[PDB]
Design a protein around this ligand. Structure first.
Ligand SMILES: [Mg+2]
Ligand SMILES: [Mg+2]
Ligand SMILES: [Mg+2]
Ligand SMILES: [Mg+2]
Ligand SMILES: [Mg+2]
Ligand SMILES: [Mg+2]
Ligand SMILES: [Mg+2]
Ligand SMILES: [Mg+2]
Ligand SMILES: [Mg+2]
Ligand SMILES: [Mg+2]
Ligand SMILES: [Mg+2]
Ligand SMILES: [Mg+2]
Ligand SMILES: [Mg+2]
Ligand SMILES: [Mg+2]
Ligand SMILES: [Mg+2]
Ligand SMILES: [Mg+2]
Ligand SMILES: [Mg+2]
Ligand SMILES: [Mg+2]
Ligand SMILES: [Mg+2]
Ligand SMILES: [Mg+2]
Ligand SMILES: [Mg+2]
Ligand SMILES: [Mg+2]
Ligand SMILES: [Mg+2]
Ligand SMILES: [Mg+2]
Lengths: 126, 151, 100, 115, 99, 82
RNA sequence: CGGUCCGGCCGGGAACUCAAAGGAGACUGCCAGUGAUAAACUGGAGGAAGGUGGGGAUGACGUCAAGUCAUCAUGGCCCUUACGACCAGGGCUACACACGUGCUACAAUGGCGCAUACAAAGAGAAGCGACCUCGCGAGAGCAAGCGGACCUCAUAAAGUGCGUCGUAGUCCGGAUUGGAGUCUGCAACUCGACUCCAUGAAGUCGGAAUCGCUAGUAAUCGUGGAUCAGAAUGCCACGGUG
């Protein structure tokens, strides 16, 4: 018996599995410190496990593919905040109050014609 | 903007400590989006300062920013046929936004060998009321009393 | 373009595709490794006597309708303007105006 | 310190220090210190003396300060004194390798120079 | 097994052309493996419009080659024959492939 | 430079002409409209005349020139100075 | 689940990411308040998305006799041993100077050397050309694989860790010049890109005046494509940090 999530940040797709346990964190068969560089990424990957009091009770299996180093952090954040709504469901009001259920609908914005970047003009003379 | 009165946006907290004050300060140290080296330089200098002052690591910062928050400053009007400066008071947010910007504008003008040292010096000096930060503060804070006849 | 240029192209392509047997049996002897170093000097003097236009480098893709040399596209076969005038009428299949 | 014609500074490392000669960069500067059995983060100071006694043997099998400058300023004068196109671009003082000179020939033409 | 590609430009004309193959295999026998939606190459093109001098005015067109693929597991004689009986409307390409 | 393993370039109409003109000796200046040939060592001591864009320019070829191609003694566009 | 060379590889499985067809979804629809009882607007509840959710596509009547007769078609006019047509070699690339647009820097938030992770969107038969060997390196040698979610191009770089460096025209910066080479190509002299060995200029943040940007935005980082036998620091695309 285990519960499941799925989250999408910028260009990533996390995939999270929750079991009751002691606190193990495995990502692509790596321990949590072996994958991520910065302590803010280790913060944001953990954040909703700290928010509710469920660090100790549960272990989790995580697979993530494609994206950047923030994409595969916000993706797992959205993944766990989905996957804990299939655990007790009265976590939902406080996760929503905390602002973790909303999937960020931001994405890279394309380059148009005659614009040297997405909105940067070229220069100007008279 | 002309019409839409708009909101000051949210921010992540700091990685290490837990204060949303430092979230602007790690951002103002930055060039070209690399927030990691900005997160590293600041958490080195906020240990070197925390050793040199003998205070706690979070508490060596606010009581050196206190000496560089202003209280009033000028803007410009020209209502009639004459430019006036005007001493207006400053808002509680732009207070800190000016404070954390003067320090970093100063700390890229020293002669040391590293950014950590250039910011630890610049915080110890503005913790002892000397330096290119509080001298700029004296200039801004004196252009109110040189213009209090305008209001 | 002018009415002579397209005649020059349909005179060039015939030679360049007719002599295609000899200019893959001179470059073989030239750019080989173990061949004769005194036949590699006659197979380089034949290559300047096969006629100059017979060469698949010496021809720009003219348009299939007008004759405009610049602004080609290889896939359609028509120029920069005569792809617009067909694709905004309907003669090229699947060619809807893109946005995304 | 005095190695192969002119002196070499001592405070710099061996690899960065040997480039002070005219005619060694960071390829021959590792060729010498790997064909003479020396490390690469010891200085000219705190070496020994026989190490210099064999380093001076290793360096002078190339062409160095005298020979390089005489050969280069031999070949330049030879290219001048025929009528070669590199010769005319030498003896006019204009770029030689086919640069655009409607603007921006400044490294050959010296300074910016009004009429 | 016997696999067939379907390429087209229009997904109201690829779907009838593949339902008239699944309802040929499932009328001469059985064991078709459905249509499987492969990737869709979008060959973009970007041209100018103005005949002389306007580098900041462009039209952008695309071509979206729709793929499909259909497998056939256990073929009889009439199962392979009633497929090569079948032609399809123009716009759709096929390429039969045993294995 | 060329690839070496193709050997040097020379036209046939100048190679056969120069092997005839050595073995007939005359220093009547040999003219050519082929300014792309690598000058060969048995062309040492000849008066040829390469095209430049307008007319031939005469070139008396010595030992020193034999690496180069025949263009580099015909400067192409005239220049005097502003 | 079971074997497992600890490589979803191999029996298997249809769950899941994902690939695509058809649908559900957002309407100021809902609770409150200001309103001229209406039009609306301000907050907040539910929701993944709040008021046009974020971008694109679409440019009214018309204007400056705007821009090209040199894409093509054209009304009149001018030429017809020439203003037509074939060929070799030159020319658009010259340079005393001025202006406009971009790239690389002037360095410690950074040079160099070693190890180490995470992308997206494209392209390919006269084509993309992995493996293996020779070469210090561009690349030649041999010959599988692929009309491609199969095979290639293809390694992402910024980053993270450990060193070295110590404010110098510098191990900063790569301009310019010499010697030796590789490839496509009938042919790189005027004129090709690229790699190695040398050379190491000008420049320490830039005058008056001016330019772009309101959130995945500006700022930096790499990759692909079109045109193309070879040849863009521009053009058009997509993502990474933010
Ligand atoms: Mg101007
Ligand atoms: Mg302009
Ligand atoms: Mg605005
Ligand atoms: Mg061409
Ligand atoms: Mg040197
Ligand atoms: Mg070098
Ligand atoms: Mg432009
Ligand atoms: Mg609310
Ligand atoms: Mg709301
Ligand atoms: Mg006009
Ligand atoms: Mg005209
Ligand atoms: Mg016509
Ligand atoms: Mg011609
Ligand atoms: Mg031009
Ligand atoms: Mg200027
Ligand atoms: Mg370094
Ligand atoms: Mg290609
Ligand atoms: Mg090898
Ligand atoms: Mg350097
Ligand atoms: Mg070199
Ligand atoms: Mg200087
Ligand atoms: Mg300095
Ligand atoms: Mg190309
Ligand atoms: Mg971007």
């Amino acid at each position: 018996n285990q519960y499941y999530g799925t989250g999408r940040r910028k260009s990533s797709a996390a995939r999270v599995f929750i079991k009751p346990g002691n606190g193990k964190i495995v990502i692509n068969q790596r321990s949590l410190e072996q994958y991520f560089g910065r302590e803010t990424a280790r913060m944001v990957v953990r954040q909703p496990l700290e928010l509710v009091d469920m660090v100790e009770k549960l272990d989790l299996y995580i697979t993530v593919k494609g994206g950047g180093i923030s994409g595969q952090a916000g993706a797992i954040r959205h993944g766990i905040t989905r996957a804990l709504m299939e655990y007790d469901e009265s976590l939902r009001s406080e996760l929503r109050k905390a602002g973790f259920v909303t999937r960020d609908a931001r994405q890279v914005e394309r380059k148009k014609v005659g614009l040297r970047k997405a909105r940067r003009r070229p220069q100007f003379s008279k | 903007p002309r019409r839409r009165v708009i909101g000051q946006r949210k921010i992540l907290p700091d990685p290490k400590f837990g204060s949303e004050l430092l979230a602007k300060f790690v951002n103002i140290l930055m060039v070209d989006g690399k927030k990691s080296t900005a997160e590293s330089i600041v958490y080195s200098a906020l240990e070197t300062l925390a050793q040199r002052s003998g205070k706690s690591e979070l508490e060596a910062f606010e009581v050196a920013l206190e000496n560089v928050r202003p209280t009033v400053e000028v803007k410009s009007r020209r209502v009639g046929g004459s430019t006036y400066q005007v001493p207006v008071e400053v808002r509680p947010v732009r207070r800190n936004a000016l404070a954390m910007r003067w320090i970093v504008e100063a700390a890229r003008k020293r002669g040391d060998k590293s950014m950590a040292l250039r910011l630890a010096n610049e915080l110890s000096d503005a913790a002892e009321n000397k330096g290119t930060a509080v001298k700029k503060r004296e200039d801004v804070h004196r252009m109110a009393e040189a213009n209090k006849a305008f209001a | 373009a002018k009415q002579s240029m397209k005649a020059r192209e349909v005179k060039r392509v015939a030679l360049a595709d007719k002599y295609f047997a000899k200019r893959a049996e001179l470059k073989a002897i030239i750019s080989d490794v173990n061949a004769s170093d005194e036949d590699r000097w006659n197979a380089v003097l034949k290559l300047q006597t096969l006629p100059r236009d017979s060469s698949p480098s010496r021809q720009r893709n003219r348009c299939r309708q007008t004759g405009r040399p610049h602004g080609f596209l290889r896939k359609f076969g028509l120029s920069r303007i005569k792809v617009r005038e067909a694709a905004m009428r309907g003669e090229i299949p699947g060619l809807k105006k893109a946005s995304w | 310190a005095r190695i192969a014609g002119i002196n070499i500074p001592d405070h710099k490392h061996a690899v960065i220090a040997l480039t002070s000669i005219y005619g060694v960069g960071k390829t021959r500067s590792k060729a010498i210190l790997a064909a003479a059995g020396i490390a690469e983060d010891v200085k000219i100071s705190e070496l020994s003396e026989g190490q210099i006694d064999t380093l001076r043997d290793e360096v002078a099998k190339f062409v160095v300060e005298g020979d390089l400058r005489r050969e280069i300023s031999m070949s330049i004068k030879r290219l001048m004194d025929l009528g070669c196109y590199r010769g005319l671009r030498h003896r006019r003082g204009l770029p030689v390798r086919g640069q655009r000179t409607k603007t921006n020939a400044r490294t050959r033409k010296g300074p910016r120079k009004p009429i | 097994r016997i696999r067939i590609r379907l390429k087209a430009f229009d997904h109201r004309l690829i779907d009838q052309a593949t339902a008239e193959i699944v309802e040929t295999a499932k009328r001469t026998g059985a064991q078709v493996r459905g249509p499987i939606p492969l990737p869709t190459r979008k060959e973009r093109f970007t041209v100018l419009i103005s005949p002389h001098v306007n580098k900041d005015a462009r039209d952008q067109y695309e071509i979206r080659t729709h793929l499909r693929l259909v497998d056939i597991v256990e073929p009889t004689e009439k199962t392979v024959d009633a497929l090569m009986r079948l032609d399809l409307a123009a716009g759709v390409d096929v390429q039969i492939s045993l294995g | 430079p060329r690839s070496l393993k193709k050997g040097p370039f020379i036209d046939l109409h100048l190679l056969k002409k120069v092997e005839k003109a050595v073995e007939s000796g005359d220093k009547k200046p040999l003219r050519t409209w082929s300014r792309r040939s690598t000058i060969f060592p048995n062309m040492i001591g000849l008066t040829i005349a390469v095209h430049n864009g307008r007319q031939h320019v005469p070139v008396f070829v010595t030992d020193e020139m034999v690496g180069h191609k025949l263009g580099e003694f015909a400067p192409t566009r005239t220049y005097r100075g502003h």
